[PDB]
Symmetry: D2
């Protein structure tokens, strides 16, 4: 329960089943396998429903964690690992690894430094998905995780990465066998609904919004969290919550900060996250100012329902050829990598209630040590 | 033959068949229909072979030019109009209109101001496409156009927008009936080949490279033009050349400049084009510095054959789901619109021999008047 | 109001903007432009939202009808013309033209022969779409059209081709300005909802089902019409109904029949439609038995929500790369063209409440004359 | 070297990583793991370059073969397993398993019964791919495999399933380091080239054609094998050949036959393969005649370069949205499954020199036992 200092490393994936850079970090003593508490990565699949790159990476990474540690494959299975597929354009497949640091390697400081808390919610039934029961169950797990990270002020929470169930053929039918209804009968739509409801639960937990109603979900886009990054996948019947923020008195060399991207072109929002994280930059920063101190950024993007960016129409929402999810991801990947100078960026789509409409939250993790 | 001063206006398309903003410019006396000499735009189709948005726009625009002028529909048919389809991500459909200015509306100056020259090459036979016969025929038409713009120094050419034939079922077979071979038998590939060969012809005309050989085409990517922007489409059996540069002693309020984007994230390359065009900007510019003085940028993009950007792997070239053409366009659309602050940007793909590999030329047109 | 004898001709489109075969039929005296009462065709676009091939064909065909007749372009605009885009696989672009026959060219018979009735429903408001108000307004227009065709027994209705509104940004917002809700906020989904609600209205009008409830729409797939073929498109704020059946005492040389395809592979269902239309065939027919007597077939297809065909799983519903609409269309295009021997077949997708789940209605028009 | 009797079983895949039906066949004593000599299956990925479903299935199947047998994972790695991805439309993921039968389970007969031979070619260098060196190396390995199956008359070869290298970034560059050229620089194209050259090598080995020249490859489509089914994938630097035919004096209960599909709608070609395999059927067969005696069919399909089927134009080759590979696969999947009544059919694309243009070979394996 007490927070520990964190080591965080961003590593490339050299192929779909590659975990060799994790293995290397362990071999070289940078981190200990059994101390890996979360992994959050980008994989090269389509970013849709039938994206099998997520399970390939998952197997490769868990295999390393089981092989190089004393944890059993069962214990290793409980480690939250979130793979956001789809690396359209320049986005480079990668994983960000979070591990606790042994006491004999930390210098405690009163400065804010990175902390991580993890929680699983109560079981999320198909008829919960996208409705206020999901919102309340999420909210309670987010408070659990926040406590687990040592954080009492929501202002010190900067990034809440989640994973929640989808609605499948199997679960839609289970609901129906019990005389329950589901919000939608399509798998694809349910990913966006699942993320959106979860986001609302985050927003409620952190005091960003009042408890909303069922009719708000997917509709009242003015209600949102400024720190939620939600993902979904068949593997669970609960929400997995990873809270990332800062705490004082922990030590460590990393710090997290955040802002929002107001729209897909809002580079200044990204720079604002980096400054918030504690890097001192010029008034007009450039990627060349970073000198290896930016570990990663994590952000959400979306096409707004109004079909416009900076007053100009685009055709993303009507495009039956290439889903707007993939279009906007590629676009924002560029806008983001142009700030960071590094195409290994965590850029995710499906952003309902995650940041303002047409935008998204952005978190930055920086290295403030020697 | 003598150059005239140019008025250039960028207008949105509000729908696929909309030319109302052109009609408005004519009604309001900004330009005269019969003085429109070129149009270069972005349309909302797929950007591929079966993109019928190009012909829809074409009809809409030519209808206005015929209705509001004294030119016959035949004369109006000779006006070069280039539609680059595919507006992935935020890119906004639009057209940039170039028109000559009556003598009683120009103040002649020795400063460099925008000039346009136009030429059609000799007939380009199917077995010419992608080979040195195309290169030589292009080169001669580019010299013709350069002369037509009043430009003697290639250093004053900043943007050469072209349109060249594709290879179709019909033409591949014509070649064969005469006992000729073609470079490739696939329509899709032939668009990229056609643009690449044309680019080489531009590079030869301007002294950027020595005359290459057949085996160089599509292969020697170190050979390229820094001003070529080439497009292709079934409508022609000749190359249409639009040379855009500057000349002194013409007058007008617009000026063009250029640079190259070294890779997809090279915002500084875009800013370099804008400075070259004559806008004085801060050392680290931001879009908010532009205050309506940037008319448009025109640039090419591509995924490099090495599969990497700033040393990080991406999976664009292996992606059988969404062609890398569309991925990179969306990405670079974002990177570009982030510089200009305006999603109406001319961003095109198919860049062989147009700028360095993985990059492309970028031209900027700025308004230096009151 | 009284029914007339019908001439029906299926013509290819040689390109996206080609109506030359219609022009030819008129020039050769096969039919009169002013007597064309409906056109139903397949166009080569993507079959999705951003399919601009439908408007191209529409313009080309209406231009012929206005040029070669005495009807004004306004009157010609009232002719129902339905374009179902997406010709995946072998499906060949084409149009089926229905025209009335002058009295001096008909031999009246008591045999059932083809008749067509047309109606427009009351205005369909955005909050009607997919709900019982749509169902009732449709139902009344279907009764209107049935009467217009001279049909009193629903058993003589074999094919009801419709066109209904979609929900757009504009209409979703109009609803909201009046304090109304809409069934869904996504354009793509609303096409399927619009067709499904319309189908239910057809089923109610013909006595195939009892009046359903709002919650049935898109959900109770056991409720369906065996003759409905519904399509949607922004051009209208009403439903356009084309009823095609038979009546006795009219004359003419064509007759229509129908059945259902129980699943995507149900060739026997197609053969059953052809027999029902009045062609005498062997017990096990083959395409070579048809000898030019099959004008066309018109049918719907879909992937079932259970993810299976003849007890075998497929992955259509999870496929984020190529929408199942396009997969199933291509599949059923083959299965269908294999029966008819002619790839010009009207195969459409979006089949909720149109035929049993995983299947669809199929109608056949045959030539029983000399 | 001497041929053995063969047991062949077609099993579904219930998910991407499922080999449970293979495991079940082994547990139930139907076949022995160590006697599995080839597996040929369909997987649910995109059927393109970035199809990771093939490696998932591969791992799942080899894991079973290693776990349930005495072969080492190294020996199990030598078993030819060919996964053809892309199950567009109704096609159901599945694997066909071939195993030898112990002598105490066979009744020797002079009737033709199924035999399998396997060979690996000499190393295939990048500059071999698509050229006559590939053709000769293939041809020799096909003769090797034919001998390994006990077949001296090519007329007894009915299906030759292969796997050959692609050209990658890595291999294209290796070629270049040795001062060699490659046929094409694009991975996607090289899959089709690789299959086409291999097919030609099969055709040469079996006496179907004379040795062709480099310029014939991909161009002279009148040259083809009537039994070749070629696939490609990064895993090899040699061709893997699986010859399937019949031999007399072996015994077993299965027999193979073949024909060709002349075009995508040629159901009679499929029925001809089934008859050739030895099933007695009515003059006009129907799927209901099969009564469980059809194990599987294996066939190739393609869009012809002339853009037509049974004299009607389609738009497959110009479609930049959904590649014609996927369109034609879905179409032919339907046409095929309609014959077999079973959506688990091996339908593959990339058919240059495999069957006539616009068509493909089709082989059928039937169970003639009790
Ligand atoms: N809900 C999700 O996981 C959305 N994912 C889906 C996927 O990862 O395949 C896309 C993304 O994260 O950008
Ligand atoms: N060769 C071309 O015209 C390439 N075009 C093709 C098209 O416009 O549809 C894509 C682009 O210009 O970005
Ligand atoms: N609702 C529709 O019109 C469905 N359409 C959409 C389209 O035609 O673009 C697809 C089809 O008819 O097969
Ligand atoms: N060359 C190949 O393996 C072609 N494959 C590619 C793949 O399996 O992903 C498609 C098919 O076999 O139908
Ligand atoms: Mg948002
Ligand atoms: Mg380039
Ligand atoms: Mg149905
Ligand atoms: Mg073939």
């Amino acid at each position: 329960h007490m927070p520990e200092a964190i080591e965080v490393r961003k590593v490339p994936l050299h192929s779909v089943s590659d975990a060799s850079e994790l293995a290397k970090l362990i071999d070289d003593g940078v981190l200990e396998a059994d101390r890996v508490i979360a992994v959050i990565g980008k994989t090269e699949g389509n970013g849709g429903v039938n994206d099998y790159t997520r399970i390939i990476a998952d197997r490769a990474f868990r295999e390393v964690l089981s092989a190089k540690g004393n944890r059993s494959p069962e214990e290793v299975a409980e480690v939250p690992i979130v793979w956001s597929g789809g690396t359209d354009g320049v986005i480079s497949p990668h994983a960000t690894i979070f591990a606790t640091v042994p006491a004999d390697k930390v210098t405690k400081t009163d400065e804010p430094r990175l902390t991580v808390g993890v929680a699983m919610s109560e079981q999320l039934l198909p008829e919960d998905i996208g409705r206020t029961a999901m919102i309340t169950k999420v909210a309670a797990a987010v408070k659990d995780a926040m406590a687990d990270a040592g954080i009492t002020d929501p202002a010190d929470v900067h990034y809440v990465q989640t994973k929640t169930p989808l609605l499948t053929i199997h679960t839609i039918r289970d609901a129906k066998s019990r005389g329950k209804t589901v919000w939608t009968e399509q798998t694809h739509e349910s990913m966006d609904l699942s993320n959106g409801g979860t986001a609302l639960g985050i927003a409620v937990a952190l005091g960003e919004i009042d408890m909303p109603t069922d009719e708000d979900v997917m509709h009242s886009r003015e209600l949102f969290s400024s720190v939620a990054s939600c993902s979904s996948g068949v593997e669970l019947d609960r929400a997995q919550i990873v809270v990332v923020g800062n705490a004082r008195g922990v030590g460590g060399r990393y710090r997290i900060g955040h802002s929002v991207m107001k729209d897909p072109l809002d580079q200044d929002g990204i720079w604002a996250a980096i400054r918030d994280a504690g890097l001192e930059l010029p008034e007009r920063p450039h990627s060349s100012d970073l000198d290896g101190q930016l570990v990663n950024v994590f952000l959400k993007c979306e096409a707004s329902q109004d079909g416009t960016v900076r007053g100009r129409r685009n055709a993303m929402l009507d495009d039956s050829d290439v889903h707007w999810h993939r279009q906007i991801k590629s676009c924002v990947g560029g806008v983001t990598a142009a700030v960071t100078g590094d195409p290994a960026v965590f850029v995710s789509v499906s952003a309902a209630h995650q940041g303002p409409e047409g935008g998204g939250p952005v978190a930055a993790i920086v290295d403030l040590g020697q």
